[PDB]
Design a protein around this ligand. Structure first.
Ligand SMILES: *[C@@H](C)[C@H]1/C(=C/c2[nH]c(/C=C3N=C(/C=C4\NC(=O)C(CC)=C4C)C(C)=C\3CCC(=O)O)c(CCC(=O)O)c2C)NC(=O)[C@@H]1C
Ligand SMILES: *[C@H](C)[C@H]1/C(=C/C2=NC(=C\c3[nH]c(C[C@H]4NC(=O)C(C=C)=C4C)c(C)c3CCC(=O)O)/C(CCC(=O)O)=C2C)NC(=O)[C@@H]1C
Ligand SMILES: *[C@H](C)[C@H]1/C(=C/c2[nH]c(/C=C3N=C(/C=C4\NC(=O)C(CC)=C4C)C(C)=C\3CCC(=O)O)c(CCC(=O)O)c2C)NC(=O)[C@@H]1C
Lengths: 162, 172
């Protein structure tokens, strides 16, 4: 998987050399930022259920047709509502993983790769997920650099969907 | 490959779980030991040529048959390939230290190295002796009390040792 550390190694190894001060400074950079990343990861995790349920509700409120129209792609059935909250939970979980490793690798590998095909195939609208992510950003209650870290990854997902 | 942070994430994802608070605490502690880890990698890298050259010299005086005509390290082409092998192992060991995980070694060192050597007639047991000499010198240099903030790096030194041992086991 891709992380700031494995990328530094990959860079050295691709050039057949030992790690240089450029790579050690890059790792130092990840270590210094980790305090804010882990504060955000801890906060998001302990508040997961609340953020997921509130995010699902924000989508249903913004897009009422999603809870009314019949069809497997909608949240108009019990299975539909369960899959919607599940999906939102997957996005929140990937965000915490990125915060932990210090990069977008977990999101890139487990969610972004194949995203376009899945959304088109199952008739899932990108904008539904953008609203759920916007809710999380507005309600996580973090401040300072921890809010910065959380939002950077949330925005990275929003950009992939836009 | 993976570093220690990614290893924990991949495991959690397979179970569909958020990391627990104790897992987060464990990762925070690894970040705390960060400066120490960087000192080790920097010290080993900065003395790489010395570590390799002295280990090579020691190997060849202990096992002179390696360099006599017909020996596996005879001719400059084979000697250069031999020195390169030692540098490669040291390089991969340093990658494992910064990553805090041996996986980096696995996807390479496990590229049938002991099979490769056998087919080429490279004495794996002699390579293991060279790795052992590099291990002792690398630990001495990395753990030198001079010119560094004094503190305890014992946990790191054991970790460093396990990576050299893993490489020495793989070549034979
Ligand atoms: C065991 C390895 C030995 C040892 C290590 C030790 N180092 C520190 C402190 C620091 N080491 C660094 C070095 C780096 N930081 C970087 O960003 C880079 C890469 C660019 C390097 C090489 C730094 C900045 C520190 C902190 C400042 C300082 O000089 O103290 C400690 C103290 C604990 C800490 O984390 O601060 C220790 C114990 N000390 C020994 O006695 C061992 C031989
Ligand atoms: C020195 C302590 C040895 C010795 C070494 C020789 N190795 C030769 C070939 C060779 N070495 C490897 C090493 C290897 N380990 C890895 O981790 C990786 C990848 C990062 C590699 C590539 C390989 C794969 C090979 C294959 C051929 C090559 O690339 O050169 C070698 C040359 C053999 C020959 O060409 O005849 C030698 C001499 N030999 C000694 O006597 C001591 C013990
Ligand atoms: C919720 C905001 C809205 C919504 C959701 C909804 N999603 C599905 C089904 C799928 N969702 C995924 C997504 C993921 N699977 C993954 O592995 C990952 C990464 C870890 C993600 C993000 C996939 C692949 C599917 C299809 C396979 C499956 O069923 O799980 C459905 C059902 C679609 C169907 O045709 O059965 C629903 C209901 N629907 C809404 O109306 C909300 C606004």
């Amino acid at each position: 998987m891709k992380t700031p550390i494995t990328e530094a190694i990959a860079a050295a190894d691709n050039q057949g050399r030992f790690l240089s001060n450029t790579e050690l400074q890059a790792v130092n950079g990840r270590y210094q930022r980790a305090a804010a990343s882990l504060e955000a990861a801890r906060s998001l995790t302990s508040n997961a259920e609340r953020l997921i349920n509130g995010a699902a509700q924000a989508v249903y409120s913004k897009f009422p047709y999603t809870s009314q129209m019949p069809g497997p792609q909608y949240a108009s059935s019990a299975v539909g509502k369960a899959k919607c909250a599940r999906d939102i939970g997957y996005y929140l979980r990937m965000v915490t993983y990125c915060l932990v490793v210090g990069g977008t690798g977990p999101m890139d590998e487990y969610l972004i790769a194949g995203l376009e095909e899945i959304n088109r195939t199952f008739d899932l609208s990108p904008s539904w997920y953008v609203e759920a992510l916007n809710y999380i950003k507005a309600n996580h209650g973090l401040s300072g650099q921890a809010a910065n870290e959380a939002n950077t990854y949330i925005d990275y997902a929003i950009n992939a969907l836009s | 490959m993976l570093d220690a942070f990614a290893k924990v994430v991949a495991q959690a994802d397979a179970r569909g779980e958020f990391l627990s608070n104790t897992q987060l605490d464990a990762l925070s502690k690894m970040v705390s030991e960060g400066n120490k880890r960087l000192d080790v990698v920097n010290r080993i890298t900065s003395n790489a040529s010395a570590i390799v050259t002295n280990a090579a010299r020691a190997l060849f005086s202990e096992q002179p048959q390696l360099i006599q005509p017909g020996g596996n390290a005879y001719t400059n082409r084979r000697m250069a390939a031999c020195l390169r092998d030692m540098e490669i192992i040291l390089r991969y060991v340093s990658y494992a230290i910064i990553a805090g995980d041996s996986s980096i070694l696995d996807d390479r060192c496990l590229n049938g190295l002991r099979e490769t050597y056998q087919a080429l007639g490279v004495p794996g047991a002699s390579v293991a002796v060279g790795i052992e000499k590099m291990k002792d010198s690398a630990i001495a240099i990395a753990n030198d009390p001079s010119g560094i903030t004094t503190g305890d790096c014992s946990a790191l030194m054991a970790e460093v040792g396990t990576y050299f041992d893993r490489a020495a086991t793989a070549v034979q």
